[PDB]
Ligand binder design. Structure first.
Ligand SMILES: N[C@@H](CCC(=O)N[C@@H](CS)C(=O)NCC(=O)O)C(=O)O
Ligand SMILES: N[C@@H](CCC(=O)N[C@@H](CS)C(=O)NCC(=O)O)C(=O)O
Lengths: 209, 222
């Protein structure tokens, strides 16, 4: 069976795990745990990192012996599963929109892990994010999903990162309420609800120590 | 006729410009200049930013009314031009390889920016000291991946070669010592630089190995 490896955190793994849930794909989850305080050693990972046949060793990774796939890179992993489950654009027009939003999503990840991993930084996130969330609200418009009536991989990516931000400071979404309905639309998908109601599910931690 | 807009810096725009050159596609280059010292105001950009019909106004941008395309996001723009010109994977095996390398490339862009655009002298050194510990293993990864290949996927150039070119150059011009034992990569950069249309581009009067980043940044300012 396919293996998804990652830390015991939501982090970058979650959008992938949400996609696997929605699609019903069987996979084994290989979770690597950090060390005790304040060591926080990554040995569980570092001792295996270079021995898994990965071209660019890193977390997350995705392995499927049957298909001959050993992969790293979150966007590349989720793009791979999306094309395997038809969660991609059916037109270049759609694909343009999807890939803009993919990159807009990662732009929020990138400048959130610059703040979370900072008095002057958290002050600066607060000034920027509102305009970015307004942009996304204006893009979603009255659509059920970011690209329209059909759910695509980019909805899972957007879900995770917007949740992270909501948990950080909900006040930011005050000027973008549509997203809260969007986050609920996604939370109400049958397999996502079942994933979010697991015993294994833990909204925290999202990032490491 | 199609319009590519960006700052007057190599930055994120160069991989796109390299692809357009190689493919021979006609485009209008629209370049926004920073203001004087120390304002460097983005006025030229900020005055137009919201008048171009862009969903997520940002630089770089690409517009082609004939095709109905108004786009932003560097990775999305280069993937679009690649699909249009056949510089993408022809198999899932290739697409996996290309997209891992795409993302491995951007991971280096992201890390270098943090270090180069940092202002605090203490933080910049801490970041640099940390870049130097990481990049050797990243370059080994790329060398191991390229193997004996002409280009990153074999004998056929894909969009991700132009991305890799730009970012490896940025790193070379920052610390060549990192490539002292990376001949495969140095020969790779030479293979790309000697493509007929890339040679012409890098030999333009317009071209300038600097600036790479913006004035605010410590490295690549000019
Ligand atoms: N470009 C990679 C970056 C992955 C990454 O930064 N992973 C972090 C966790 S957020 C890590 O600790 N990786 C383990 C390592 O680099 O050894 C991706 O997006 O998949
Ligand atoms: N994810 C975006 C990021 C673009 C970006 O950060 N552009 C910088 C130049 S390095 C800029 O100054 N533009 C922001 C603005 O002024 O709107 C992309 O790659 O297109």
């Amino acid at each position: 069976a396919p293996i998804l490896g990652y830390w015991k955190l939501r982090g970058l793994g979650e959008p992938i795990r949400l996609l696997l849930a929605h699609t019903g794909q069987e996979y084994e989850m290989k979770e690597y745990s950090f060390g005790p305080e304040p060591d926080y050693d990554k040995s569980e990972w570092l001792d295996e990192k270079f021995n898994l046949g990965l071209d660019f060793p890193n977390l997350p990774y995705y392995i499927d012996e049957e298909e001959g796939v050993k992969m790293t890179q979150t966007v590349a992993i989720i793009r791979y599963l999306a094309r395997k489950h038809g969660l991609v654009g059916e037109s270049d027009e759609e694909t343009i929109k999807i890939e803009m939003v993919e990159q807009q999503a990662i732009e929020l990840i990138f400048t959130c892990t610059r703040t979370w991993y900072f008095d002057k930084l958290k002050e600066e996130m607060m000034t920027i994010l509102p305009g970015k969330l307004i942009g996304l609200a204006k893009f979603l418009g009255e659509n059920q999903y970011i690209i329209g009536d059909r759910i695509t991989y980019v909805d899972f990516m957007l879900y995770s990162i917007l949740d992270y931000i909501r948990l950080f400071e909900e006040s930011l979404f005050d000027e973008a309420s549509s997203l809260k309905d969007y986050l609920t639309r996604i939370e109400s998908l049958p397999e996502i609800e079942k994933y979010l109601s697991s015993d294994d599910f833990k909204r925290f931690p999202i990032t490491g120590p």
